Structure formats: structure tokens, C-alpha cells
Design an enzyme around this catalytic site. Structure first.
Site, mmCIF file in Angstrom:
data_model
loop_
_atom_site.group_PDB
_atom_site.id
_atom_site.type_symbol
_atom_site.label_atom_id
_atom_site.label_comp_id
_atom_site.label_asym_id
_atom_site.label_seq_id
_atom_site.Cartn_x
_atom_site.Cartn_y
_atom_site.Cartn_z
ATOM 1 N N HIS A 122 0.934 -1.122 0.000
ATOM 2 C CA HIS A 122 0.000 0.000 0.000
ATOM 3 C C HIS A 122 0.975 1.171 0.000
ATOM 4 O O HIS A 122 2.094 1.086 0.546
ATOM 5 C CB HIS A 122 -0.819 0.216 1.288
ATOM 6 C CG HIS A 122 -1.722 -0.934 1.651
ATOM 7 N ND1 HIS A 122 -1.414 -2.052 2.310
ATOM 8 C CD2 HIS A 122 -3.046 -0.997 1.303
ATOM 9 C CE1 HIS A 122 -2.488 -2.789 2.375
ATOM 10 N NE2 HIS A 122 -3.458 -2.143 1.756
ATOM 11 N N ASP B 59 2.417 1.981 3.309
ATOM 12 C CA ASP B 59 3.396 1.076 3.879
ATOM 13 C C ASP B 59 4.771 1.565 3.442
ATOM 14 O O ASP B 59 5.714 1.457 4.218
ATOM 15 C CB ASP B 59 3.298 -0.344 3.375
ATOM 16 C CG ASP B 59 2.022 -1.080 3.647
ATOM 17 O OD1 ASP B 59 1.434 -0.935 4.709
ATOM 18 O OD2 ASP B 59 1.623 -1.823 2.770
ATOM 19 N N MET C 50 2.097 -6.255 -7.829
ATOM 20 C CA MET C 50 0.842 -5.620 -7.519
ATOM 21 C C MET C 50 1.080 -4.577 -6.470
ATOM 22 O O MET C 50 2.048 -4.652 -5.719
ATOM 23 C CB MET C 50 -0.134 -6.720 -7.053
ATOM 24 C CG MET C 50 -1.503 -6.306 -6.479
ATOM 25 S SD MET C 50 -1.497 -5.567 -4.794
ATOM 26 C CE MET C 50 -1.823 -7.021 -3.828
ATOM 27 N N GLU D 208 -11.097 -6.332 -4.574
ATOM 28 C CA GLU D 208 -10.992 -7.303 -3.524
ATOM 29 C C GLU D 208 -12.260 -7.261 -2.667
ATOM 30 O O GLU D 208 -12.437 -6.293 -1.910
ATOM 31 C CB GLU D 208 -9.754 -6.957 -2.709
ATOM 32 C CG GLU D 208 -9.514 -8.115 -1.798
ATOM 33 C CD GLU D 208 -8.348 -7.918 -0.884
ATOM 34 O OE1 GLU D 208 -7.245 -7.593 -1.311
ATOM 35 O OE2 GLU D 208 -8.597 -8.092 0.287
ATOM 36 N N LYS E 109 -15.005 -8.213 0.520
ATOM 37 C CA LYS E 109 -14.951 -8.606 1.922
ATOM 38 C C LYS E 109 -16.355 -8.335 2.482
ATOM 39 O O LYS E 109 -16.910 -7.258 2.245
ATOM 40 C CB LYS E 109 -13.867 -7.788 2.677
ATOM 41 C CG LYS E 109 -13.677 -8.378 4.083
ATOM 42 C CD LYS E 109 -12.721 -7.507 4.843
ATOM 43 C CE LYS E 109 -12.380 -8.167 6.156
ATOM 44 N NZ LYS E 109 -11.393 -7.379 6.874
ATOM 45 N N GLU F 12 -10.186 -13.310 -1.571
ATOM 46 C CA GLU F 12 -9.339 -13.753 -0.484
ATOM 47 C C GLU F 12 -10.045 -14.862 0.246
ATOM 48 O O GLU F 12 -11.221 -14.701 0.571
ATOM 49 C CB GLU F 12 -9.059 -12.591 0.434
ATOM 50 C CG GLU F 12 -8.361 -13.119 1.666
ATOM 51 C CD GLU F 12 -7.813 -12.044 2.577
ATOM 52 O OE1 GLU F 12 -7.137 -11.166 2.116
ATOM 53 O OE2 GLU F 12 -8.043 -12.095 3.770
ATOM 54 N N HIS G 131 -11.996 -14.046 3.476
ATOM 55 C CA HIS G 131 -13.133 -13.158 3.235
ATOM 56 C C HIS G 131 -14.377 -13.894 2.757
ATOM 57 O O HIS G 131 -15.436 -13.602 3.310
ATOM 58 C CB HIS G 131 -12.854 -12.119 2.179
ATOM 59 C CG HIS G 131 -11.765 -11.169 2.563
ATOM 60 N ND1 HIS G 131 -11.378 -10.167 1.801
ATOM 61 C CD2 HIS G 131 -11.064 -11.106 3.736
ATOM 62 C CE1 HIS G 131 -10.491 -9.482 2.454
ATOM 63 N NE2 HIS G 131 -10.298 -10.028 3.637
ATOM 64 N N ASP H 234 -5.631 -13.772 -3.063
ATOM 65 C CA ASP H 234 -5.042 -13.647 -1.742
ATOM 66 C C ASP H 234 -5.313 -14.874 -0.899
ATOM 67 O O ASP H 234 -6.451 -15.252 -0.628
ATOM 68 C CB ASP H 234 -5.593 -12.449 -1.045
ATOM 69 C CG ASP H 234 -4.989 -11.116 -1.461
ATOM 70 O OD1 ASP H 234 -4.207 -10.972 -2.395
ATOM 71 O OD2 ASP H 234 -5.332 -10.158 -0.820
ATOM 72 N N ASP I 79 -12.079 -11.394 10.992
ATOM 73 C CA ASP I 79 -11.050 -11.671 10.021
ATOM 74 C C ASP I 79 -9.664 -12.055 10.622
ATOM 75 O O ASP I 79 -8.889 -11.200 11.052
ATOM 76 C CB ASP I 79 -11.065 -10.396 9.231
ATOM 77 C CG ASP I 79 -10.138 -10.439 8.054
ATOM 78 O OD1 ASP I 79 -9.981 -11.528 7.482
ATOM 79 O OD2 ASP I 79 -9.614 -9.378 7.724
ATOM 80 N N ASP J 194 -6.788 -13.923 9.176
ATOM 81 C CA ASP J 194 -5.567 -13.913 8.366
ATOM 82 C C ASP J 194 -4.457 -14.821 8.859
ATOM 83 O O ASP J 194 -3.298 -14.461 8.996
ATOM 84 C CB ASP J 194 -4.975 -12.549 8.263
ATOM 85 C CG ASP J 194 -5.857 -11.617 7.511
ATOM 86 O OD1 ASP J 194 -6.711 -12.041 6.737
ATOM 87 O OD2 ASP J 194 -5.666 -10.439 7.726
ATOM 88 N N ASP K 273 -1.782 -12.895 1.983
ATOM 89 C CA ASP K 273 -2.179 -11.788 2.805
ATOM 90 C C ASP K 273 -2.626 -12.377 4.131
ATOM 91 O O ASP K 273 -3.802 -12.684 4.348
ATOM 92 C CB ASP K 273 -3.292 -11.066 2.155
ATOM 93 C CG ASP K 273 -3.627 -9.785 2.919
ATOM 94 O OD1 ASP K 273 -3.085 -9.400 3.956
ATOM 95 O OD2 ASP K 273 -4.490 -9.107 2.438
HETATM 96 C C1 LIG Z 1 -4.729 -5.173 5.071
HETATM 97 O O1 LIG Z 1 -5.121 -6.091 4.065
HETATM 98 C C2 LIG Z 1 -6.263 -5.718 3.283
HETATM 99 C C3 LIG Z 1 -7.421 -6.725 3.500
HETATM 100 O O2 LIG Z 1 -7.524 -7.778 2.915
HETATM 101 C C4 LIG Z 1 -8.485 -6.388 4.510
HETATM 102 O O3 LIG Z 1 -8.998 -7.507 5.165
HETATM 103 C C5 LIG Z 1 -5.951 -5.665 1.762
HETATM 104 O O4 LIG Z 1 -5.216 -6.802 1.347
HETATM 105 C C6 LIG Z 1 -5.244 -4.374 1.354
HETATM 106 O O5 LIG Z 1 -6.091 -3.256 1.374
HETATM 107 C C7 LIG Z 1 -4.659 -4.421 -0.046
HETATM 108 O O6 LIG Z 1 -5.403 -5.280 -0.870
HETATM 109 MG MG LIG Z 2 -6.531 -9.144 1.105
HETATM 110 MG MG LIG Z 3 -8.576 -10.567 5.808
#
Ligand SMILES: CO[C@H](C(=O)CO)[C@H](O)[C@H](O)CO
Ligand SMILES: [Mg+2]
Ligand SMILES: [Mg+2]
Ligand SMILES: CO[C@H](C(=O)CO)[C@H](O)[C@H](O)CO
Ligand SMILES: CO[C@H](C(=O)CO)[C@H](O)[C@H](O)CO
Ligand SMILES: CO[C@H](C(=O)CO)[C@H](O)[C@H](O)CO
Ligand SMILES: [Mg+2]
Ligand SMILES: [Mg+2]
Ligand SMILES: [Mg+2]
Ligand SMILES: [Mg+2]
Ligand SMILES: [Mg+2]
Ligand SMILES: [Mg+2]
Lengths: 386, 386, 386, 386
Positions: free
Chosen positions: A53, A56, A87, A180, A182, A216, A219, A244, A254, A256, A286
Site C-alpha cells: 500500500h 506502507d 501488484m 478485492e 470482503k 481472499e 473473506h 489472496d 477476520d 488472516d 495476505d
Molecule cells: C490489510 O489487508 C487488506 C485486507 O484484505 C483487509 O482484510 C488488503 O489486502 C489491502 O487493502 C490491499 O489489498
Molecule cells: Mg486481502
Molecule cells: Mg482478511
């Protein structure tokens, strides 16, 4: 055992191994990582690339002097390691100005700023070599029903993505967007909550071809959906631009987790699908190393992601290659699902007495599908008990 | 209090008040209802029409003699009451020949039979006046991953809907199809699990315009999704052809409670949306009177469906009409969400210093959205404490 | 290999492989199985015994000569095979009279009938050598709030369990009761919805020692709970009298997949716990072969239940036996968890300056837990990658 | 109208209206509130008192003079307003040292520190007049299976609660403990995940009478459980020592919406139960004003918490007072549920031929329960449609 190679196309975001451990009920457990150190440790682990990002890489609020230096150090780390940047994405969720959204914030001036912040990072991504630009609209949504008119917010969301498409077309940039999905968190409900909603939306954009999805694992599992089925529909539609990978153990916040954890059978069926469909994009992780871990636990979690993908790749390839599984797929009539229902059109079908008038419905009803046997062969392959 | 009128367009399937109470752990608690008695009692309750599956009207296995008689009695009940038949559907899930699906069964001969059974009922629906033909693919899916290749099953599903579209076009019939999504049950995972997946799929059909969705309240709530948001995306896409109303209390088996039960705030926001978007199709109830009830409890549950819709219609209309709510929507900047982000295009946006260079991000960050106040005004309207 | 033998204590309900495939949206896809042929086919598969509901062995409404004849031929199948009957239970959910419950039905006469139907089957179970009598109250609950006063329903439920305890005590029967919890289905909400609620309830009964729990994998997973954690609390309380093993893929209707399917990692951690805690009871399978299957797929699914338990038993034993895992457990300080916090007592802990005023909080905060390394060793063992 | 007065016992945590808006994906959107200004703004809203975690009132790491100064000015805000402190608790989840738990952390030194941090705040709570001491173990749990041996963790958890009971008993303090259950978040799974598990655990402690539960609306709803049913079991057991009121819209992350929001019908049935059972404790609100809101939206959300409880109190009282509802309850035989099943005893029930051999099962099976009529009267009362 199972070592990552550059041809496996494993990538990681700076924010994944870089997560400090701050969560809704607690402070950070780890120090901030320098991006340069992250590119070096990931290249040593066998990763092929990193994503980021904008916030970051360059701290929000950096002057164009400080920005230049950040970018400059980063690019030196990449050039020294041969790491790629496949990406990139924008952070439109951390800063309090985005508390009601970026592209669908009710305040017009916040939407314009969200668009300017994004275009700026699209210019950087393209010079670093990114071919996919991801949009995760984490703040687009609501906690209450009159706070957002959703039909008008989809107009604003369509307008934002059409302006981004107009901008990369006039610049002649070779970059595609991936949405993406969610279903929730951090908003009570997020707009375009699943792969299917994101796919349907793309079709209403002025340039549909420029846009695909970055689904993802955790998600779609937050809505209790089957992630391999969602990915097969994205591949069928020609829209799996990126993916992802991580783990999630059910419908809850969530998590991860590293890939392989969470729903292990779904990770097996996902690798089987990605590998047999010949998906060629990055295998991006991710995930967040749990905040219980120190920095050694971070690189162990990151290595575990790639290892689990390679063990499942091998078990899946062995499943499909086994003559006995091939025979069991014929027995469950998976070859017959591939034959057209009525390739001579509806008038042939209508004329055919055997399709209705003379169909023996109870003979057909009594054929067993032999699915449990086929699934226990898949179980023995996954577990290496075959 | 709150009496249904024909202009409210309330309809019910024969299978809803007609449910005998048979569930996974128990036998029927009620006798079978005669369709003729159902048309008469529903016309007395103030309903406008009835819908049916072919097997609700004509017993599976009826000769063309017995079929004729069934249809004939039914049509006499309708003609005597002035009841309409707005929609009809096929049962491709009860008979054991459909244990692996109708349109996406692995056995080709079962898929052909599913298509012939459907076309036959499309001819009947059109002469009875149905303008929407619903497809609920309850058996399309799987309990295990190698049992169904999902990309090939979507080819077969696209092929079935394209053949149905070719057939009604050559007959010159004025009937549109509506796909009814459901994430699971009776299959472990059903194909096209939510509104969004069904919307994305329609776009890949040869005649997209012929097809829309028939979303159901409890089905999107089985994936924990916000049903008013899914409906706003279907309306934004121009595809809300029909809707099924009922209640569900969370992510669990499919309950089909009467409308209003389950998530009451979501039913309020749904009626508000349907009424303010000027949706004009049937308000169809697909619910099951609990098996604890006798036949009087059945008509009380059916009447409760319509009553709850009319009380919520009134509270929603009162919410929107209140000057103080209108003032609170301006305060939460809902009027500003309706203004274009950058109507002078991306080059104006890029030039605008106030959109980035000179945007005061902390002044904007500090504006409160005033959403809780607006939502407590919505709470006072729903509860009639305003 | 992984061949089951009667030494493994694998048991199956007559209703499991005997399920005909009737579900909420479909009719039976298989013929009824004779109890006698089920006892001999399972003995050949390597099973140890069978369990039954009264209505599985003796059809409801059998005259006492028909009842006697059914028991007689069942008992001779049992004697010819060496098969045992470890457990039995009552069907208080199928017949229409139980539509509002058995022990907590609002109608008093139905509650007395439910107790008489249960006492009759306790006499039969003790004659066949059953040591555990299970009570699954699938109809105790409600779909609406005023239908059931839950404090009074729990008084009726305590009353029923105390009367059954008085009865077996006056008969001097050596039989104990196990309550089987389920959160929902077929009722909107079921009373005593999880292991914890059943465990808390038992402490309020007159003879608590006579009662324990029969947890089922899929039931706790329908509430999104961790089933190995739930079993660890039942074992810590000394109340795991029996267990039902199957698979569930998330929060949705109750699937009863074969054991090993659904959440595979939770099946591994469950077997690791049962085997290391030294659980000595039956490993009972309460699953339903999918209705897609014929009678051969039925015995394949039953056989996969036992195979998966034996493969996971082996991987769990290998995991715990590995020196590298043993070392990983010390590194994550699982040895220190076994040490008493303050065996020195409260006044010594209060006087201990190293426990508070001189405790270096930031040095402890910085120790990583090394949990991800440990979990990847577990993953490698489960997949046979070591 | 619905104006709160201190007679209504409405209380709020300092952390509720004092939440700054920092969530997993975003920074703070509001400034910290001074405890002193929170005590006076809530007294003006009609609140009765406030609750605190030690670290809410005294910043972690305060020297004892800074500690004393904080308590002193808090105590004088309290004295000037007539506000009370009914409850207090410890923060054993925010600081990095608690990343693996407080009372069940694998590191022994951390478990001794967690007990010393808690005992220090028990002395302070008793000085301010707190009668309930809450323990929410948000960090007791795990994300992976081998990280926590749950039988040993429950031995450490019992050990910690027995040592706190020994301590308050030797001090002769009049304070009791309430365990607050949560199924997950921030850990993958939390120990004692629901009301039932906390109730069962209490029975194994040395002084069970000193401990009860502090259930929270949203926590039980994160496991999809019926919160009014869970509270009825805690009241039946005599263990509802305190309650936390808020809203949650389904199984997802923990929202802490204002009370009344989320599942509105469960809020109505909850108030109906608290009010008719005669619960006399604080009606405590543990909610977080959404981060979209400024400080004015904070006090609006807090005020809506109390308003919604008073509107629902009135509708519940009107429902139960209605003669037509009273009649509907007899019709659904809720009076018969209150009658003992067999007060005549087991041998009289066994000799009673009308309970079994002469029971007309089909006549009882045919009586409808009239539950839908009853539930629509409840609906009409909730919406003020009568
Ligand atoms: C912090 O991770 C994010 C996400 O998945 C939220 O659950 C995305 O990956 C990010 O905004 C870039 O895609
Ligand atoms: Mg993601
Ligand atoms: Mg997530
Ligand atoms: C029995 O109801 C069905 C359903 O919703 C399944 O949950 C459909 O409504 C029917 O196939 C016609 O659409
Ligand atoms: C069909 O099986 C039952 C059940 O669990 C349904 O969810 C019980 O197992 C049985 O009543 C005895 O235990
Ligand atoms: C932030 O609040 C806590 C909680 O419930 C989080 O889920 C507790 O309420 C508190 O620790 C005292 O009860
Ligand atoms: Mg339904
Ligand atoms: Mg429907
Ligand atoms: Mg089950
Ligand atoms: Mg069971
Ligand atoms: Mg909470
Ligand atoms: Mg709380």
C-alpha cells in the site's frame, strides 16, 4: 523438504510480515519492520516478489523529499535482490478522514481526495513494474441503514472506477484493476461483499475488460461460502486477475492465519483448482503472523505459507494422476458433465421421446453417484495414506 | 387494523400455506391442502395471487387425463375469485432422480429430462398469465470437492438457461426468468449462492435481458449478508424481477418464518427500499407456517405476513416524510453522496489543488457523520415512539 | 494399514447407515435397511457395536407381539456376530405428538407420555447390555419468544431427568445418562444448546453423578465453537460419558458428514485429545451417508469413518512422539502451564516483589510464544510431510 | 416520554463513550475523554453510575502519586454528582505481556503478575463501593491446537479464581465475581466461550457462591445463540449477577452497537425477561459509539441506549398486561407448562394407563399450539400497532 523457487511466484505484502500486532483490544507486540529488511528476508525465504500500500512505503504526510528517499531505498533493495513488485494498492482505510469510505464517502471532497491519493500511487506502481492494481474498499459501507443509500453509493463507486480507467487508458499504462471483496469488518457491512457481487458490478463499468477480482480465502469464508466454488466462477468468467491466500476458521472476525491453517480441505481443493486451471498470476499471501510471535515466529509463519502450498500442490497432483481416482471420476460421471446437454438444440430435445415420454425416471433415480468413495480417495491423497 | 388490498400485490405459493410440516427429523403435522381451497382462503385473506411449482398442481406421475382435471379445477377456482398467477416454477429437487441436480446433474439424461419437465411447465405458466418464471436450483451443487467440476457445471447451467431462452423467444412468449439464489441446503453448497453470483452469471448468458433475480430474505441472511444491500444492487443493475419475503433468525438451517419475524430492522429497511424505489412486482411470501400449528395457525401466519408488511410500509413512509429526518439526512450528507465526484473528468480533478495539495485532511477527518442520531430517529419511527 | 477391528470400539447408530435420504426438500433415495442386515454388514466392516432409538428397532405402534418378535431377531443377529449394544436412546422428535417437545412440551399429558415411552426403552436397553442412555432433546425449544417460558421449561426438564434417575436407582440398574446438546434444528433454538449449557444443567439435578454429556462434532460447530476445547472441558469436569463423531462444514444446517470430512484439523486435534486423555468409551459415528449414494456408497462412507479415525490416530501419536515437537512444546512453555501459579499461597504471592513491583513487564512482553513453528510441525505430521 | 433517571440503574463503562475509534484497520477518530468529564456528562443524561477497568482510570505504569491523584479527582467527580460505581474490572488484555492470557498464560511469571494486578484493583473497587467484580478473560485461549492444553489451562483458571476467592474472604470484603463469556476475538477461540460454559465452570470452584456470570448480548450472538434463553438459564441457576447490554448484527466481529440496535426482537424478549424476573442489578451498557461519530454522536448513542431500554420496557409491560395476550398464553398452554409433569411420582406415573397404554396420541398430535397468533400479538405490541 518442499523449498520455494521463483517460478512458484510466491509474493507477500509489506503489511503481512510487517504487522506489529495491534488489534481491537491490544497494543503492538512487535517493532516496525523496515521495508528494505523485509525485501531481503523474503528473498532469502524464496519469495518472488512483494506488494505494498502507498502508506506502507511512504509514511502518510511525507513531503516529496522524504517520499523520494523512501522510494529510493526500496528500489535499491529490489534491484539488489531481483525481487519484483507484481501488484500495489492504496490505503483508503487507516486515516480518520476515511472513516466513512474513500470512493463512497458521503462527503464529496473526501471522495476527490481518495481519487487523487489513488492516481498518485498508480503512477508509482507502474514504474515499479506492477501489472495489477488492487482496490479493497474496506471503509465503503455502513453500520446503519439510512447512513448510506446503496444505489447512489454504487453510482459513486462506478464513477470512481470509471475515472481510474479513463486515467490509465489516456496514460497508455499496461495495468489492470482487481477488486478485492470482503463481507464485513471494519464496517458493519461492506459494499460488494463477495466475489459474485464484485463480478456483477464490473459488468456495469464503462471498460469491463480493465477490471477483475482479487478474492481472499478468509473473506468468502466469513460469509460461510465455498472459496474454491467462488474461484471457479471467477475463472469461468475470465476475471481471476489475482488471489489472496490465507486461512480462516469459520464465521468470525477476520483472522488472516497463514495459508493452510483454517479450512485445510478447502485449501487442498483450491490448490487443485488453481493448478489444474493453469492460473499463472502471483500466489500472494495476505496473512498476519499472530501477535503471540516474535520476529522469528514471523518468518516461520511466512515460510509455513509457502510450504503448505507446495505440499498441497503435490497431494493434488498425485490425486489427479492416480488411475484409481480417474476411474472413480468416470464412475461418478464427471466425464458426462462435460458433454453438452442438447447440442442439437431445443427442437431435437423436444422431439426426443427418451428425454421425457419414455425416460425411465426410477432407473435413473436408483443410480448411485459413488461420491463418498471418490471423496475418501481424495482424503487418502491429502493425508498421504495413498 | 392494516387490511390487505389487491393493489398491495401480495402473493403466496401453494407450497407455503400448503406445507404439511415434514422436516429432517419428523413427520407431517398437517393434512394436505387442496389447491382450490388454498385459492379461496387466500382470496378471503386479501391476497392478490398464487404461484406454484408444477408438482404442487399436478402430482408427479399424473397421466395427461389426470393432469387436465387438476389444471381444470385450479383454473375454475381462479376464475371464480379473480386471483391471478404472477409467477410459476418447476420442482427440480423433490424426486430422487434430481439427487445430484437438475440442470447440472452429472448424468446427461437427467439434465435433458430436467429441461423437458421445465419447458412443459413454462407452457402452462404462460396460459395461466405468469409473467415471471422462477428457477431455484436447490440440488445444483455438492457436498464434496471432486464430485462437481464447477467450471463445467456453469457451462451446463449456462447451456440450460440459454436453451430455455431460445425456446420462449421462438414461441414469442412474454415471460422473463428469475434465478433464485441460496447459499446451501439441501446441498452442502449450492451453485450461484448469493444475489451477486446470480447477477454476475446472467451477464454471461446469450440473452441477458431475459433474466433477472428472485432474491429471498432468509437465503442471503444464511450467508450473514445484508438483504437490503443485496436488493439495492439488484435494483441498481435493473434485475429485481421478483422477490421472496420471509424471516430468518441468523446463520442456521433455512427457517422460512413469516415476514417480519427474524431480523425486524432488516425487514423495515427492505420495505423502505422497495417502496421508495417504486418496485412494482409481487410482494411474494415464501414462508412455512411452523409445524407446531394447525390449519388456523396457518392462516394466522399468512395474514401476519401481509400485516407486518403494511405496518412497516407505514413506519417507513413516516420516517422519510418527517422534516426532522430530512434535516438529519442533510446533516449526515446524504444529499452530497448524490452529487458526482468529478463531473468535469479526471483532468479537472488532477489540476485541482484543493482535491489534494491543499485539502485539509484533519478538518475533514474531524467532521462527525451524525449517523447514530439519524439511526435513533429511524428506531423511534419503527417503534412508533415518534 | 488402517483396518478397523472390534478392539477399536467403533459403533454406529441403526439410523446412520439406515438413513433413506429423505431431507427437507426431497424424498427417500434408498430403501429401508433391515436391522439384522445392518448388524452383520457392520460386523464385517470391523465395527464393535450398534446403538438404536426405540423406533429404529420396533416400528411405532407395534403390538407387543410384533415388538417381541423384532427384539428377538435383533438379539439373535447380535449373538451370532459378537456385536454389542453400548448405548440406546428414545425417539422423542419424529412423531407429530412431539411437535412442541417431549419433556418440555407445554401439554402436560404429552410430557407424561414422553417419560413413559423413555422408561419402556430404558428397560429394553439394560436387557441388551447398554451402559449409557442418551437423551437428545431435538424438539425442546421454540421458534418464537412467548411460546416457551425457559425458566419453567428448565424446571420441567429437571423434573423429567430427576424422575428417570429415581427410576433407574429404584430398579438398581447400572446405566448412566448422557445429554446430547444441539444449538438449533429442528427448533429455531433448542434448550441446552452446547456442551457448556448441558454441563451446567447437570449440576442442578438431584443425582448429578448419574449424568454426563454426549457431545457431537457437528452440533458445537453449528454454533462456531471449538469442539476439541468443548471436549477438554467435559473431560476436565469428568463428564464425557460418550461422544458422537461426524463432520460439519461450518455454520449451516446439520450435515452429519462422515468423520474426517468437514473440519479436518479439528478432527485431528479431537483424536489427539481423546487418545492422550485416555477416553475409553465407544467411538460412535452418528453420520448420514449423502442421499446421492446407493447402498454401496453407504458402506463406503461408514468404512471411511473408521479409516479416518485410524489415520488421524496414527498422525497424532507420531506428532506427540516426535522429539522435535517435544522440544517445540518446551519452547512454547507448555511445561510451565502445568506448574501451579501460586502453590506458595496468596500471602506469599502478595509479599512477592518479583510478581509485581520488580516484575520486568517489557522483558516478558518481548518473549515470543513460538506457536507458529509448533503448529507447522503439527501440520507436517497431519499431512505426513514428516 | 422515555427520560432516564438514576432510578433506572443505567450504568456505562468509562471505556464505552470513551472509545477513541481505533479499530483493526484504522486509527483514532476521537480525542481521549477525561474520566471526570465522562462522570458529569453521563449524570446529566440520567445515568446512575459508571464502571472502569484499572487502566481506564489510572494509566498503566503510573507512579503511586499519579495513581492517587487520578483516583482522588475521580472520587470527587463522583461525590459532586451522586454517581455510583457498581462494578469494576481489570484490564488483562491490552498490554503486550498479556498476549497469551493473564490467568492461563503459559508463562508462570505472567500469571502471578496478572493475579497481583487484579488484587490491587479489587482493593480499589471495594473502596469506591463496587459490589461486583467482573473478569473478562479476552486473552485466555488460542489460535492453534497445541499452543494451549485446555484441561491444564482450566486448572490454572480454577487456581486463579480460587485464590481471588480466598483473598476477598480473608479480607472479609463484600464483593462477588462475575465471569464474562465471549466465544472468540481477540483470540481465535476463547476459554469459557458462552454463558453455559462459564456456569459449568463455576460449579467446580472452591467457593461457587462467590461467582456468577456477566453475559453480554453481542457475545452470545457471535455464536448464533439465543441471548434471552441464555439469560433464562443464568436466572434459573441463580447466577445472573450483572448483565452487559449492546447490539450485534449476526455472527461476525464484535460490534458493540448501542442497545436496541442489531437484533431488535431479542432486545424486546430480553427486557421482557429482565423485567418480569425482577432482575435488580445494573443495566450496564458496554457499547462503542461508531468511529464515524464525533463527541456529540457519542452522547447521542449513549442516550439512545437508555431510551431504547425504556421504550422496550413499556411495550413488554403492555404485552403481558393485555387480556388478549393473557388469553393467547392459555390457548398455547403456557399455564400447563407450569404444572409438574408427575408430582404423583414415578410409580403412580407407571401405573397410569392414561399416560401410555390408553393415551390418544393422534388426538394430542392434532392440537395446534397457536404460537403464531401469540407471536403476532407480540409483534403488534412491539411496533405499537396495538
Ligand atoms: C490489510 O489487508 C487488506 C485486507 O484484505 C483487509 O482484510 C488488503 O489486502 C489491502 O487493502 C490491499 O489489498
Ligand atoms: Mg486481502
Ligand atoms: Mg482478511
Ligand atoms: C420451496 O421453496 C423454494 C425455496 O426457496 C428453497 O429454499 C423455492 O421458492 C421454489 O423452488 C420456487 O421458487
Ligand atoms: C439422529 O440422531 C440424533 C441427533 O443428533 C440429531 O441431531 C441423536 O444422535 C439421537 O437422537 C441419539 O443420540
Ligand atoms: C471492552 O469491554 C470488555 C469486553 O466485553 C470486550 O468484548 C469487558 O466488558 C470488560 O473487560 C469488563 O467487563
Ligand atoms: Mg428458504
Ligand atoms: Mg424462495
Ligand atoms: Mg447432527
Ligand atoms: Mg448425535
Ligand atoms: Mg463485545
Ligand atoms: Mg462486556
Amino acid at each position: 523438504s518442499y523449498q520455494p523457487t521463483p517460478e512458484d511466484r510466491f509474493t507477500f505484502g509489506l503489511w503481512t510480515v510487517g504487522w506489529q500486532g495491534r488489534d481491537p483490544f491490544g497494543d503492538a507486540t512487535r517493532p516496525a519492520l523496515d521495508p528494505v529488511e523485509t525485501v531481503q528476508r523474503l528473498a532469502e525465504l524464496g519469495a518472488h516478489g512483494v506488494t505494498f500500500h502507498d502508506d506502507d512505503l511512504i509514511p502518510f504526510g511525507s513531503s516529496d523529499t522524504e517520499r523520494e528517499s523512501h522510494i529510493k531505498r526500496f528500489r535499491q533493495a529490489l534491484d539488489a535482490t531481483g525481487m519484483t513488485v507484481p501488484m500495489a494498492t492504496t490505503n483508503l482505510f487507516t486515516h480518520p478522514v476515511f472513516k466513512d469510505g474513500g470512493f463512497t464517502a458521503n462527503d464529496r471532497d473526501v471522495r476527490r481526495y481518495a481519487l487523487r491519493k489513488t492516481i498518485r500511487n498508480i503512477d508509482l506502481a507502474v514504474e515499479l513494474g506492477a501489472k495489477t492494481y488492487v482496490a479493497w474498499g474496506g471503509r465503503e459501507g455502513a453500520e446503519s441503514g439510512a447512513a448510506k443509500d446503496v444505489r447512489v453509493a454504487l453510482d459513486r463507486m462506478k464513477e470512481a472506477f470509471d475515472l481510474l480507467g479513463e486515467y490509465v487508458t489516456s496514460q497508455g499504462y499496461d495495468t489492470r484493476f482487481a477488486i478485492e471483496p470482503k463481507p464485513n469488518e471494519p464496517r458493519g457491512d461492506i459494499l460488494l461483499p463477495t466475489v459474485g457481487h464484485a463480478l456483477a458490478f464490473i459488468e456495469r463499468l464503462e471498460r469491463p475488460e480493465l477490471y477483475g477480482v482479487n478474492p481472499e480465502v478468509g473473506h468468502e469464508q466469513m460469509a460461510g461460502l465455498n472459496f474454491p466454488h467462488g474461484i471457479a466462477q471467477a475463472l469461468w468468467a475470465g476475471k481471476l486477475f489475482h488471489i489472496d491466500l490465507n486461512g480462516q476458521s469459520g464465521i468470525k472476525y477476520d483472522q488472516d492465519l497463514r495459508f493452510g491453517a483454517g479450512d485445510l480441505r478447502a485449501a487442498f481443493w483450491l490448490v487443485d483448482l488453481l493448478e489444474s486451471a493453469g492460473y499463472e498470476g502471483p500466489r500472494h499471501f495476505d496473512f498476519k503472523p499472530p501477535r503471540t510471535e516474535d520476529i522469528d515466529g514471523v518468518w516461520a509463519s511466512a515460510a509455513g505459507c509457502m510450504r503448505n502450498y507446495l505440499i498441497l500442490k503435490e497431494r493434488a497432483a498425485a490425486f489427479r494422476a492416480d488411475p484409481e481416482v480417474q476411474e472413480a471420476l468416470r464412475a461418478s460421471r464427471l466425464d458426462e458433465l462435460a458433454q453438452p446437454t442438447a447440442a442439437d438444440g431445443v427442437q431435437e430435445l423436444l422431439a426426443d421421446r427418451t428425454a421425457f415420454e419414455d425416460f425411465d425416471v426410477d432407473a435413473a433415480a436408483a443410480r448411485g453417484m459413488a461420491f463418498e468413495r471418490l471423496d475418501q480417495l481424495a482424503m487418502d491423497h491429502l493425508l498421504g495414506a495413498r
